[PDB]
Design a protein around this ligand. Structure first.
Ligand code: CLA
Ligand code: CLA
Ligand code: CLA
Ligand code: CLA
Ligand code: CLA
Ligand SMILES: CCCCCCCCCCCCCCCCCC(=O)OC[C@H](CO[C@@H]1O[C@H](CO)[C@H](O)[C@H](O)[C@H]1O)OC(=O)CCCCCCCCCCCCCCCCC
Ligand SMILES: CCCCCCCCCCCCCCCC(=O)OC[C@H](COP(=O)(O)OC[C@@H](O)CO)OC(=O)CCCCCCCCCCCCCCC
Ligand SMILES: CC(=O)O[C@H]1CC(C)(C)C(=C=C/C(C)=C/C=C/C(C)=C/C=C/C=C(C)/C=C/C=C(\C)C(=O)C[C@@]23O[C@]2(C)C[C@@H](O)CC3(C)C)[C@](C)(O)C1
Ligand code: KC1
Ligand SMILES: CC1=C(C#C/C(C)=C/C=C/C(C)=C/C=C/C=C(C)/C=C/C=C(C)/C=C/[C@@]23O[C@]2(C)C[C@@H](O)CC3(C)C)C(C)(C)C[C@H](O)C1
Ligand SMILES: CCCCCCCCCCCCO[C@@H]1O[C@H](CO)[C@@H](O[C@H]2O[C@H](CO)[C@@H](O)[C@H](O)[C@H]2O)[C@H](O)[C@H]1O
Ligand SMILES: CCCCCCCCCCCCO[C@@H]1O[C@H](CO)[C@@H](O[C@H]2O[C@H](CO)[C@@H](O)[C@H](O)[C@H]2O)[C@H](O)[C@H]1O
Lengths: 74, 188, 214, 173
């Protein structure tokens, strides 16, 4: 999965051409502009990140009581 | 215009003809890379080091097989490449990790010199300035031959060193043992 | 259906192919290459894709090989391998009088009775695995040229390597070179089908493994 | 010119019915030239090296440590090849392997117009002799090899297929 993006060698995806291709006839322009947003503002980043990490910690707590991974912990 | 060694294709652009052993053999364009902290200067510093280690490793295998170990070592065995290495480590591992720390001090400093030697172009690739004998205060045409003989023997030693390691771990016999075995089977 | 069809940019509706006179000639075929009778009933030469993409991907840089050029380069390599493989398959079987085998017990008749079981027998031993690495080195050192010609930086003909150690063709008229080249192709074509014959029969339910395989 | 050269003698002259000297370039003909020169010298030594010892010439002493020259009392001369030990059969090839180098590493190769394979170990200078008399000798050298290339093939075919050669099948070999 760490080969899906383009850096210095031609091969790979640019994040900008991905998002800008996604536009339906209900969404209008779709995802245009979300790059400038997510590469010029630290607040927009935390808003995703904290929502994800917080959801992850909830997900983590549900999986450790049902499938206990350590020995003698259950 | 055309590679001397691959005469059907163009000679790579940075292979000037100045380094010893340059016959224009680089079909994949590896001399062209200038990213991730490596290039033709780093690749040549790599190659000369691979040369040197492999030239010492071939003689080091042939020494303790033809004549046995140094005085102070015992319990000699079948192959001298692996079988003696784990054996000595178990016997007295002090001299072997003395060297691993001494190599580690030399390598950390030679790695700084390679990065400092490319920023300011005044360190020749491979050159540590080790010439105590003075071969190099002589003829420039005679010293250019010594540069090419180091590369030519070092390239051949890389196949021989990687040879003797792998067929040592495969047949579990000595390197001269493997040569006489192959002589017997293809007796022809 | 209302765009301009793709049948027109690759079919040339003016002339007809020498082989199969009822089909029109493919656009990239000429009389230029050796061994050419205009034979392409499936219009493969006409596919507008860059087949150098398999070696190097198209996203590396601007670049394009002609489709016809990559085909000729394939067909020569398919010819060369099959001329040696058919010849080498029979020679180790004793089809030319002498059962030609490498010195040593491992490649003798008692361990391998005929060539049909030489691939599976040598694969386990390792001699097969060694030849895979030895070809691998050559292929890598010879397939980078396809890239150069695709960047327009080379004027080398397909399948052309300066391999003429006995100097067959130094100073030969283009008529002499073209005729010789046609021999590489015509004998190569017959040997591609010869090896496909021998490998097929020798693997059905009957069929022997003698010099004649019927 | 194929007729004016060492190897074109009286009873045939230029012998090339299928036109093989024209088949390549001048560098091609020089390769075939010193091939036949080398094919001759191997076959002259093998034809002669066969007659002798088929008659029991028998080096005195031991060939190697236990495989001494009993190889002539019984086995045919086509045999006594595997009877020679491996270290004995090895030196032979490597003296040859070394002799094939000076042959190739001359100042001018032979297909570029250089000299043909000269004597590797004792290099007596051979430059001086009358080149009229030199041309007669290179006809003698090749014709004896032409006859020996046929003769060593006769000696193999007699050892494989009995009765394949009439006035030669009644010979113990
Ligand atoms: C430069 C090559 C060289 C030389 C000249 C010597 C010479 C010697 N070594 Mg030595 N040694 C060498 C390489 C060498 N070694 C290497 C490469 C190793 C590492 C494996 C050792 C490890 C070693 C040990 C562990 C010991 C010696 C010992 C000795 C001495 C005993 C001689 C003896 O009794 O002979 C018969 C002798 C002065 C012994 C000694 O008493 O040293 C004074 C001893 O205990 N050596
Ligand atoms: C397509 C060609 C081809 C292939 C793939 C094989 C494959 C095989 N042969 Mg075979 N053979 C061939 C042609 C071929 N043969 C021809 C043309 C001859 C007659 C001249 C023979 C004569 C022959 C004998 C006598 C024997 C085999 C045997 C074998 C088997 C083991 C050999 C091995 O492991 O490699 C070991 C050999 C090598 C590693 C040699 C080096 C090969 C190099 C690296 C190939 C690259 C050079 C190539 C010519 C191309 C040049 C470059 C190109 C750009 C022009 C294997 C099944 C043996 C066997 O099992 O018999 C049943 C055996 O005894 N072969
Ligand atoms: C194709 C070449 C050839 C090969 C493969 C062999 C191989 C062999 N010979 Mg043989 N031989 C040859 C040529 C050859 N010979 C010739 C040309 C002669 C002289 C006429 C002899 C005379 C000879 C004798 C007398 C005996 C053998 C024996 C043997 C066997 C043991 C190895 C040995 O001592 O060889 C030694 C080979 C040589 C000394 C000849 C090669 C020397 C090189 C080519 C330099 C040429 C020397 C000289 C300038 C030319 C003289 C030839 C002519 C003018 C008389 C071995 C199988 C012995 C054996 O085991 O018997 C079965 C044995 O008794 N050979
Ligand atoms: C001048 C250098 C020289 C030296 C020191 C030797 C030394 C030896 N040769 Mg010899 N040899 C030489 C040159 C030399 N050779 C040359 C130039 C040829 C011709 C190519 C040969 C051809 C030859 C044959 C054919 C054999 C030997 C064998 C032997 C060995 C006998 C050992 C034995 O009986 O088994 C202990 C001995 C070590 C024999 C051998 O090693 O096998 C037993 C053997 O069979 N030699
Ligand atoms: C003293 C030992 C000795 C040795 C090591 C050689 C070595 C050699 N001779 Mg040689 N030779 C010798 C004595 C010897 N000669 C003598 C005394 C004569 C008579 C003057 C010759 C006459 C001679 C001729 C005419 C030729 C060689 C050739 C060769 C080379 C390959 C053939 C071979 O294996 O010969 C092994 C030799 C012997 C076993 C001696 C018996 C090789 C480098 C050939 C050559 O140079 O290839 C181009 C060749 O054509 N030799
Ligand atoms: C841990 C990571 C492991 C190492 C992975 C290698 C990544 C290093 C990148 C730098 C090298 C580079 O850029 O190549 C550069 C070369 C191209 O060489 C030059 O590149 C330059 C820019 O980098 C320019 O574009 C030049 O025009 C071009 O000639 O790429 C290749 O030739 C690679 C050929 C592909 C072969 C793939 C077949 C199998 C390879 C797998 C090998 C297994 C493991 C590798 C050992
Ligand atoms: C859930 C319905 C659903 O998934 O529809 C999917 C529908 C798809 O819209 P588009 O095809 O225009 O989307 C194209 C791009 O925006 C995709 O990135 O999205 C809407 O229309 C939003 C309507 C809100 C739904 C009201 C609740
Ligand atoms: C047991 C062991 O250890 O080893 C094993 C290893 C392994 C790998 C498993 C084995 C295998 C697999 C092998 C060897 C597979 C090989 C397969 C191969 C080589 C298959 C060629 C097909 C060629 C065709 C179909 C040509 C058709 C030709 C056609 C359809 C035409 O129309 C020709 C023609 O139209 C032209 C073009 C125009 C005219 O001028 C002439 C006509 C009109 C007639 C073996 C063999 O089992 C041995
Ligand atoms: C049996 C093999 C056969 C294949 C394999 C094949 C394939 C394609 N045909 Mg085709 N074909 C026939 C045979 C075959 N066609 C026959 C008998 C008819 C008459 C009934 C026929 C009719 C049309 C029309 C009217 C169009 C057309 C096209 C393409 C197109 C490219 C698509 C693209 O990549 O955009 C592809 C891949 C279109 C074109 O050129 O433009 C869009 C177009 O309008 N075809
Ligand atoms: C910080 C710094 C730098 C740096 C750096 C870095 C990252 C330096 C790190 C260097 C590093 C990490 C060097 C490893 C060597 C490993 C070796 C030699 C292993 C040999 C192993 C051998 C020969 C064989 C091993 C065996 O396992 C085998 C094969 C079989 C097994 O049965 C057992 C044995 C033991 C027999 C730069 C780059 C210079 C830039 C800057 O300037 C300064
Ligand atoms: C695969 C990984 C490749 C490993 C190679 C990395 C080694 C090179 C490290 C970077 O090398 C860097 O070079 C530049 C100038 O070019 C120097 O610049 C000063 C730095 O001091 C040095 O650190
Ligand atoms: C064992 C299998 C049985 C099959 C036997 C088949 C016989 C082989 C055919 C013999 C032809 C070979 O003979 C060779 O022919 C080629 C091409 O025609 C000629 O080719 C050469 O001369 C011809 C003139 O004819 C020139 O046009 C050409 O430029 C030149 O390369 C050679 O001068 C000749 O030496």
């Amino acid at each position: 999965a760490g080969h899906m993006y383009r850096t210095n060698w031609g091969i790979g995806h640019s994040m900008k051409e991905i998002l800008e291709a996604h536009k339906g006839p209900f969404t209008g322009e779709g995802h245009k502009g979300l790059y400038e947003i997510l590469t010029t503002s630290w607040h927009a980043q935390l808003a995703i990140n904290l929502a994800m990490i917080g959801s992850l910690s909830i997900i983590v707590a549900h999986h450790m009581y049902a499938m206990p991974p350590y020995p003698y912990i259950a | 215009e055309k590679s001397q060694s691959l005469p059907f294709m163009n000679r790579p652009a940075l292979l000037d003809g100045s380094m010893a052993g340059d016959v224009g053999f680089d079909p994949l364009g590896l001399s062209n890379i200038d990213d991730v902290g490596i290039d033709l200067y780093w690749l040549r510093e790599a190659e000369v080091k691979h040369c040197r280690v492999a030239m010492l490793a071939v003689v080091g295998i042939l020494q303790v097989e033809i004549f046995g170990p140094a005085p102070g070592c015992e319990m000699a065995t079948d192959k001298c490449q692996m079988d003696a290495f784990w054996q000595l480590w178990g016997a007295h591992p002090q001299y072997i990790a003395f060297g691993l720390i001494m190599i580690m001090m030399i390598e950390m400093i030679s790695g700084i010199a390679t990065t400092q030697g490319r920023e300011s172009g005044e360190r020749a690739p491979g050159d540590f300035g080790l010439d105590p004998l003075g071969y190099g205060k002589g003829d420039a045409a005679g010293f250019a031959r010594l540069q090419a003989q180091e590369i030519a023997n070092g390239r051949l030693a890389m196949f021989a060193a990687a040879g003797e390691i792998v067929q040592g771990c495969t047949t579990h016999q000595g390197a001269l043992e493997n040569l006489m075995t192959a002589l017997r089977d293809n007796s022809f | 259906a209302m765009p301009e069809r793709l049948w027109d940019s690759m079919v040339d509706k003016t002339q007809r192919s020498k082989a199969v006179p009822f089909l029109p000639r493919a656009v990239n075929l000429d009389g230029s290459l050796p061994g050419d009778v205009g034979f392409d009933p499936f219009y493969l030469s006409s596919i507008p894709k860059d087949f150098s993409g398999f070696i190097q991907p198209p996203q590396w840089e601007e670049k394009g090989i002609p489709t016809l050029y990559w085909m000729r380069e394939a067909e020569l390599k398919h010819s060369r391998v099959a001329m040696l493989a058919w010849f080498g398959w029979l020679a180790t079987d004793g089809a030319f009088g002498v059962t030609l085998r490498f010195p040593g017990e491992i490649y003798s008749v008692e361990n391998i009775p005929t060539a049909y079981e030489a691939h599976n027998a040598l694969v386990s031993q390792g001699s097969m695995g060694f030849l895979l690495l030895a070809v691998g080195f050559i292929e890598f050192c010879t397939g980078a040229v396809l890239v150069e010609v695709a960047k327009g930086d080379s004027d080398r003909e397909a399948g052309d390597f300066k391999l003429d150690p006995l100097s067959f063709l130094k100073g030969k008229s283009e008529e002499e070179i073209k005729r010789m080249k046609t021999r590489e192709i015509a004998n190569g074509r017959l040997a591609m089908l010869a090896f496909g014959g021998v490998a097929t029969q020798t693997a059905l339910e009957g069929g022997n493994h003698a010099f004649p395989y019927f | 010119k194929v007729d004016e050269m060492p190897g074109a003698t009286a009873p045939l002259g230029k012998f090339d019915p299928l036109n093989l000297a024209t088949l390549g370039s001048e560098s091609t003909l020089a390769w075939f030239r010193a091939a036949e020169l080398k094919h001759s010298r191997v076959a002259m030594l093998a034809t002669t090296g066969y007659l002798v010892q088929a008659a029991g010439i028998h080096f005195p002493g031991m060939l190697s440590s236990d495989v001494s020259f009993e190889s002539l009392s019984a086995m045919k001369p086509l045999d006594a090849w595997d009877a020679v030990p491996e270290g004995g059969k090895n030196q032979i090839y490597f003296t040859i392997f070394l002799a094939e180098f000076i042959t190739e590493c001359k100042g001018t190769h032979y297909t570029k117009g250089g000299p043909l394979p000269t004597i590797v170990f004792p290099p007596i200078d051979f430059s001086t002799v009358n080149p009229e008399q030199l041309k007669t000798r290179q006809n003698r050298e090749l014709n004896n090899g032409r006859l020996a290339m046929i003769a060593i093939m006769s000696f193999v075919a007699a050892a494989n297929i009995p009765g394949s050669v009439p006035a030669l099948a009644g010979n113990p070999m």
